Design a protein around this nucleic acid. Structure first.
Lengths: 103, 94, 96, 79, 79, 96, 103, 94
DNA sequence: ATCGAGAATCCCGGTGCCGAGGCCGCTCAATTGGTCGTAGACAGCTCTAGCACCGCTTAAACGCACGTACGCGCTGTCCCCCGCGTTTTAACCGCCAAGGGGATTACTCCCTAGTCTCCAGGCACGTGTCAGATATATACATCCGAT
DNA sequence: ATCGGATGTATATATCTGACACGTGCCTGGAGACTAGGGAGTAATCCCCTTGGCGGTTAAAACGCGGGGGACAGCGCGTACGTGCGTTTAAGCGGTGCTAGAGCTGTCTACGACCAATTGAGCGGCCTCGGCACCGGGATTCTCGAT
């Protein structure tokens, strides 16, 4: 009987509960805290990968190549604020020509 | 040998709940690896700095919950707060 | 004969370089740049070849992230042409 | 030597990704002068990690550690 | 109510500190619209500290803790 | 009679407000602003009076830090007058 | 016999060697590390307060009021890069009128 | 009561080595308090993140020295590295 | 500037090759079950100190006339950069070693952690009087409109 | 340009008064020893992988030229905004008042650390088959001189 499937997640809880112990974030961690943190990590990775497939579907591919994460991250107002600093390796950029440069 | 530490085969088993007829490439298994290690090592390094401000040496779930209303901007904080709370109330009753 | 107008090929190599993903500067005349900068701080280095294609994905993510905020300092002056007044304004507003 | 390795059209086709229409004839030198400032604020902070762990080989993790420190976090290599 | 508390000349004499010579007649409304965005990204992150430690009183340390998080560290009150 | 020219009193209230240290917005019509914003996230708060003079030292350090990088977007357009083209350019280059 | 005056500093070393132990930066700290860190904290505070007096001397005062730290910090190229993000409470700002605004 | 923790009377005894005919005001004792707590809690939180990158649980002086060449820009790194090194070699010999 | 001309671009449909999907096998890390100390939950009681409120007052917001100076609009002016060609240079791909240095295990002993126990440095609570801001007349610095 | 009557700002002068600096006293946090273990240094070794060199092959940089559309400076002018006086406003300040909540202590008990054995979930290596890249000819999309 695992510990994640006691709470029904997919991210591991035993693997996190060594990293709040051997990174020295603090000395003592609660028993619910590596459960509660494996949920918020899930809900964000289940948020990008929902949006990752729609760029994979709109562009008619099957796998999610790194270009498709760039459209998925940078075309949502709620999540670009979370990642306004970071970049992505070989991500490309959005199609965005200015208004006045048109013929 | 190099034994490992990755979040490869967990993220791949969240992709198979939202688009179960797609797949993921190799380098996106490297991006999504480094994406959740960002969100882990930004939230856990915030409740650490939050428990230090009140002279207290326990990272409970109540300090993670306050450290999600300060990193997720809006419309994710209104969900992921009420997402772990479901995931803790399905844990003490088992 | 046939010849386009100035203002056409620019609008078909923005719409081509905003869809591809690959490198834009070269590989080996950038690898020779990184080693010549690094023969000053510590002599006789040896780069991993996943770390010369790591700088090359960062500086391209720094210049593309500069012209997109430089060109807003050109259109603001009722003109469509960047110029070193515009680069130097892009870095004295953002942290220099 | 190699600052003229990044030629005229390779600076040109970078800027076409940024959405510019007509580059002047002076940006081709100014960009070379504002890129070599950026590599001297990364490689100077990437040798220092490599020199720290007694290694003579600047690995890919140390560069990502250098770019992370100044707010330009890079994905897709480790973290 | 109180967004018109910050009057016309008090926005004016702020901008004279910035070194401007002639303010247009439209900045006096735009500044009110870009200041109240800034206080809703501080007080929203300063109640959350005060709500955390079970206090009904937003002390001065929590504001400095809020301004520290978004790169606008403030000296002269505690740290 | 006597009357200056437009361009004089501006150059004697830049050189006066770049030497004094005190507040520029008021105290009590700013204290009424902070409470009215904070009656939304949690009702019935109670501020310490070293924390309403802590915001007032930060937002003045945010607007003065904005006009100094706004006015460089006005002089760049060969004019000496700021305008809401300039504020909106100052925040789309810096992180919005 | 103290520990600072074994090394001849002015910043305390016993007070730092609890803060590399009860902040959880790491678990084990060396014996030389809270000495070496009380030097670099001294050399910066002995760098600003050298420059703080010169603004106090040029403006003919005796105490160092918070205005004088603003001139001291922001008029040195080597130290403004260290503090390019931070502000100072009631610090004021530099006298800096642009070129074109002159009559 | 509130017992305290400040760096008040140490910074005041560095002011009396560089301008021994001046004094310091009240609020500058609050700024300089919060200034050295910045430099402390930025350097110590860097050698912490540096010892973690090499899988090592000791903050020696060699990790503080590498974490001063990355925070002090130039012409302070060429001094404060060779300032603590004098202050450690006056410590093992006593 | 509407129709035509043509260069380029969006899908058709076959080809094929090589990296994701997938069990298989090994093995270090999680889960189970007691024990221990102890941090935090809870309560209680002092007491700072923040909110309401007056009331006299005086700097400051608010409104209105107004002349001038810059905003924005136009027009010609002219070259600097786009574009298409023809050429030269060299990046790239592949080949093919020789060894530097990364990675790991292997024994060990110095270094910090922890417990112990007294003190002395640092802070709280007084307080004396010193720099500073005060005012006030006067003088030095800078314009603005007539000459 | 140069002179003139403001107009302001800067230089020097008594007088407080509320604010730093220093004496006076404690008490809890550092210091000095003493020990045990466990990390990190140090020694030493397979092989991964970078460095380097070269041939060939061609995509791409380089240089050169015609012209056309914009950057740049100027005339102009219409309205937008500053300067100033006077006129209502409400900031501020001292001052007394009310109790709400920060701020701190003891009093028990539940909570995670720690260890220790036990076994699966996780990964390393491992072929292998569907998804992605082409590779040529249809079909369109779309700017550009003209009758």
């Amino acid at each position: 009987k695992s510990r994640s499937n006691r709470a029904g997640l997919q991210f591991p809880v035993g693997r996190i509960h060594r990293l709040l112990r051997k990174g020295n974030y603090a000395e003592r961690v609660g028993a619910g805290a590596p459960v509660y943190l494996a949920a918020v990590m899930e809900y964000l990775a289940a948020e990008v990968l929902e949006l990752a497939g729609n760029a994979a579907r709109d562009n008619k591919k099957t796998r999610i190549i790194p270009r498709h994460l760039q459209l998925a991250i940078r075309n949502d107002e709620e999540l670009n604020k979370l990642l306004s600093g970071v970049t992505i390796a070989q991500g490309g950029v959005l199609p965005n020509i200015q208004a006045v440069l048109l013929p | 040998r190099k034994r490992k530490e990755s979040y490869a085969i967990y993220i791949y088993k969240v992709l198979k709940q939202v688009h179960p007829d797609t797949g993921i490439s190799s380098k996106a298994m490297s991006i999504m690896n480094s994406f959740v290690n960002d969100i882990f090592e930004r939230i856990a390094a915030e409740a650490s700095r939050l428990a230090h401000y009140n002279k207290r040496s326990t990272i409970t779930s109540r300090e993670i919950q306050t450290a999600v209303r300060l990193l997720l901007p809006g419309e994710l904080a209104k969900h992921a707060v009420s997402e772990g709370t479901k995931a803790v109330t399905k844990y003490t009753s088992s | 004969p046939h010849r386009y107008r100035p203002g056409t090929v620019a609008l078909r190599e923005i719409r081509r370089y905003q869809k591809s993903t690959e490198l834009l500067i070269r590989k080996l005349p950038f690898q020779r740049l990184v080693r010549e900068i690094a023969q000053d701080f510590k002599t006789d280095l040896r780069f991993q070849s996943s770390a010369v294609m790591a700088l090359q994905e960062a500086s391209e993510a720094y210049l593309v992230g500069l012209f997109e905020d430089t060109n807003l300092c050109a259109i603001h002056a009722k003109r469509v042409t960047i110029m070193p007044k515009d680069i130097q304004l892009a870095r004295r507003i953002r942290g220099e | 030597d190699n600052i003229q390795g990044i030629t005229k059209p390779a600076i040109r086709r970078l800027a076409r990704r940024g959405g510019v229409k007509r580059i002047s004839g002076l940006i081709y030198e100014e960009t070379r002068g504002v890129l070599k400032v950026f590599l001297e604020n990364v490689i100077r902070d990437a040798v220092t990690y490599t020199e720290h762990a007694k290694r003579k080989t600047v690995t890919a993790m140390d560069v990502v550690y250098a770019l992370k420190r100044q707010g330009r976090t890079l994905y897709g290599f480790g973290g």
